[PDB]
């Protein structure tokens, strides 16, 4: 494509939403606060505005990255693939742990789409490049690849990952988790990757840690000199309660 793209266009009211959610985040998290929300939006708009939405690079986002620097405890990181709801619910109940989307930068961009045009200097609300059909180097795809690499690269000690046990590929080598995150876990820093395979909750009494795609993930991590551990969440409807109440006798019966 050239000016007409295959993907949804910039989220309606994008500029207001970014600034709005930047203020809510910087009030609620004073350890930052030094941050100027008008300044971060300038750095974010600057990354893609008046640029060709198929020629965007990591460097375009460096301004934004510097303004959004945040050290998250490296030992409290949760990665996730396809099971977005339970991942974020988990960090809402276990409030010392973080997903990418609980950081300032991840929080700004979550569920939003954005792109510009080669010169019009306007935001394109009509359409934006689709990763598959249009081009991989688009404002949205390049943003998530850059923040996701940094997030995984910082992780230390025990890193957790939540996977969707109801997908045909529980571990997907072509996901951001499979492509970027797993190859940026440093064995000098990381002792263990521990996977949680969330069952669809109906009937899947199978040990999904023996799934061939989990065996593939295990081999990748093992070759990085990191310990791979894997457990099943058979009852997602009881998971949050059991994490907070590990001495409840209805939780321990799962051994």
């Amino acid at each position: 494509w050239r000016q007409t793209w295959s993907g949804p266009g910039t989220t309606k009211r994008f500029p207001e939403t970014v600034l709005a959610r930047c203020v809510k985040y910087t009030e609620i998290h004073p350890e930052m606060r030094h941050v100027d929300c008008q300044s971060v939006w300038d750095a974010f708009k600057g990354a893609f505005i008046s640029k060709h939405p198929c020629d965007i690079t990591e460097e375009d986002y460096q301004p934004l990255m510097k303004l959004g620097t945040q050290t998250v405890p490296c030992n409290k990181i949760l990665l996730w693939s396809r099971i977005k709801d339970l991942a974020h619910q988990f960090t809402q109940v276990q409030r010392d742990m973080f997903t990418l989307e609980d950081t300032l930068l991840g929080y700004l961009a979550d569920d939003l789409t954005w792109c510009g045009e080669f010169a019009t200097s306007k935001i394109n609300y009509q359409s934006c490049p689709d990763w598959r059909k249009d081009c991989s180097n688009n404002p949205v795809s390049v943003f998530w690849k850059t923040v996701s690499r940094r997030f995984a690269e910082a992780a230390c000690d025990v890193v957790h990952v939540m996977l969707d046990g109801s997908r045909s590929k529980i571990f997907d080598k072509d996901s951001t988790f499979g492509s970027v995150e797993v190859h940026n876990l440093q064995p000098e820093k990381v002792q263990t990757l521990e996977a949680w395979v969330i069952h669809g909750g109906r009937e899947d009494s199978r040990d999904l840690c023996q799934d061939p795609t989990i065996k593939e993930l295990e081999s990748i991590i093992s070759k990085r000199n990191i310990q791979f551990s894997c457990k099943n969440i058979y009852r997602p409807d009881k998971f949050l309660q059991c994490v907070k109440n590990p001495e409840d006798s209805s939780c321990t019966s799962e051994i």
Partner: nanobody
Amino acid sequence: QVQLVESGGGVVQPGRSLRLSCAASGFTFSSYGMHWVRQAPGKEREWVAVISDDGSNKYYADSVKGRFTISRDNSKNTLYLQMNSLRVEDTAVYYCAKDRGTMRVVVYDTLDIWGQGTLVTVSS
């Protein structure tokens, strides 16, 4: 040669203390959560306690809380259970078991490896 070997079981009177040991070999003990599970002769298994790989998490069944302490020595690859104020109802074969993961976040799944257990008898 993944192995767990429990020691310390015997016959004690109510009110006394007993320390159990569980010697681990054949795997990186210091990277796994560890459990104690007990089974009174003729009765169903009862989960007793869990300790995370780093010892930061220690959790206990309501039936032993305040009387039993779980601990580990990652240099000796040994798990312990310190039992105090023992009761007749504490009589059981005590097993140590290896978690699939770390239990820094307590997530309960099937335990992969079990010891042979050590019988503890509390009888006047």
